[PDB]
């Protein structure tokens, strides 16, 4: 989550209906747009932000939220316009001996701004004396491990979260929803619409 991945999507048709009916989603919250209306909208760019958190931390991924994940690992704007999808990955990201590869930022001087990524591993200075790259009293490593296990509770179980953000600028749009098309009618007075030409 502290090094959450971001991918830019553009110049393609986004099929929202099939994307939303693929897997069983434990969490699906869209803000500023209904899930169905995206099939009708065009946007300049799309951003796919993927990471893994705890179940109890999933609530942190929403506009106007606070917490360790919200403040130090991944921050959303209060006016976020986009969707959030989250699903348990206990059968994927949990190990018998503990899956410690997933990490999260614990100590940070200031909270993250929206869509700001912090990958610093510098020893956090929790006291007046400097740490100088040395961890100890009042000097702690800023990142902490999750250690997911299959026998943990769903709150402690890993959850994969993807945030879809829709950037709409004053530039020619690149991503739109699926175009419908009805059957053809001949030799009859009809209200036709060919490729947007009505």
């Amino acid at each position: 989550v502290y090094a959450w991945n971001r991918k830019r999507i553009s110049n393609c048709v986004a099929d929202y209906s099939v994307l939303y009916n693929s897997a069983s989603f434990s969490t699906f919250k869209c803000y500023g747009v209904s899930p169905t209306k995206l099939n009708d909208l065009c946007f300049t760019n799309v951003y796919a932000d993927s990471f893994v958190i705890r179940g109890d931390e999933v609530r942190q991924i929403a506009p106007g939220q606070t917490g360790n994940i919200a403040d130090y690992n991944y921050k959303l704007p209060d006016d976020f316009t986009g969707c959030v999808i989250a699903w348990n990955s206990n059968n994927l990201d949990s190990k018998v001996g503990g899956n410690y590869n997933y990490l999260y930022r614990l100590f940070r001087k200031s909270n993250l701004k929206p869509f700001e990524r912090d990958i610093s591993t510098e020893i956090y200075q929790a006291g007046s004396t400097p740490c100088n790259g040395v961890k100890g009293f009042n000097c702690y490593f800023p990142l902490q491990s999750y250690g997911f296990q299959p026998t943990y509770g769903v709150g402690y179980q890993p959850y994969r979260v993807v945030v879809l953000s829709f950037e709409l600028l004053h530039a020619p749009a690149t991503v739109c929803g699926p175009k419908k098309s009805t059957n053809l009618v001949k030799n009859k007075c009809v209200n036709f619409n060919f490729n947007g030409l009505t």
Partner: antibody
């Protein structure tokens, strides 16, 4: 109001274990510096260890290493101290104590945290170890 | 480990007299990391002084702390009957946190 409340008194046999609790109330429990201090009858004060729950990294005094386990439950606002392989010399009053921030008060950068009181020592739980 | 040694072990004085208690660290410590406590029989310790000389809230003006490096003192300028107790110094600047063995203040 900020207060510490220990569990009731315990009577144990040598070689067994004791687990005492300290409930903290007031403020944010996750950043609460909980320390354990014991006092044997007629003896001085001995610091055993402590924890700040958010870091999940307990500290122990070398005398108690491998016998003491300190944990915290953030959902109940409760710290626990477990002492194993008990001896008659472990007969003592066990206090919880958190002077403002334990060992992380002096922080004048990230935030304010310039609070320092003098009323954060639990009254104590008597553990008696006898055959 | 830093050890703290108090002196005297017992001090016998009358109300109205001045008490002075000493605490010696086994090595030089920052004065920021030295405290003094009072303990009455059957009561938890009460903080009197922190940072070698800063008085805790609601502690009377008769209590003062001083010293630096290895050598620290607690002074009670005029003893009151409620001051007869055990006093402990503490070093809190690194693990393990250490207390002195105590000084018992008794009525003469």
């Amino acid at each position: 109001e900020v207060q510490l409340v220990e569990s009731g008194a315990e009577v144990k046999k040598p070689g067994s274990s004791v687990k005492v609790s300290c409930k903290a109330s007031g403020g944010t429990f996750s950043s609460y510096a909980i320390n354990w201090v014991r006092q044997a009858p007629g003896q001085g004060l001995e610091w055993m260890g402590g924890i700040i729950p958010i870091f999940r990294t307990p500290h122990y005094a070398q005398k108690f290493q491998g016998r003491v386990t300190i944990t915290a439950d953030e959902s109940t606002g409760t710290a626990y101290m477990e002492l194993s392989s008990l001896r008659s010399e472990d007969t003592a009053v066990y206090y919880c104590a958190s002077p403002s921030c334990g060992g992380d008060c002096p922080q004048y950068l990230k935030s304010s945290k310039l609070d320092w009181y003098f009323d954060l020592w639990g009254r104590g739980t008597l553990v008696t170890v006898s055959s | 480990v830093i050890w703290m040694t108090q002196s005297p072990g017992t001090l016998s004085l009358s109300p109205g007299e001045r008490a002075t208690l000493s605490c010696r660290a086994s090595q030089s410590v920052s004065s920021t990391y030295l405290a003094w406590y009072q303990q009455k029989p059957g009561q938890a310790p009460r903080l009197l002084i922190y940072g070698a000389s800063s008085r805790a809230t609601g502690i009377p003006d008769r209590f003062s702390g001083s010293g630096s490096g290895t050598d620290f003192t607690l002074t009670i300028s005029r003893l009151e009957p409620e001051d007869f107790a055990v006093y402990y110094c503490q070093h809190y600047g690194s693990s393990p946190l250490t207390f002195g063995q105590g000084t018992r203040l008794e009525i003469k």
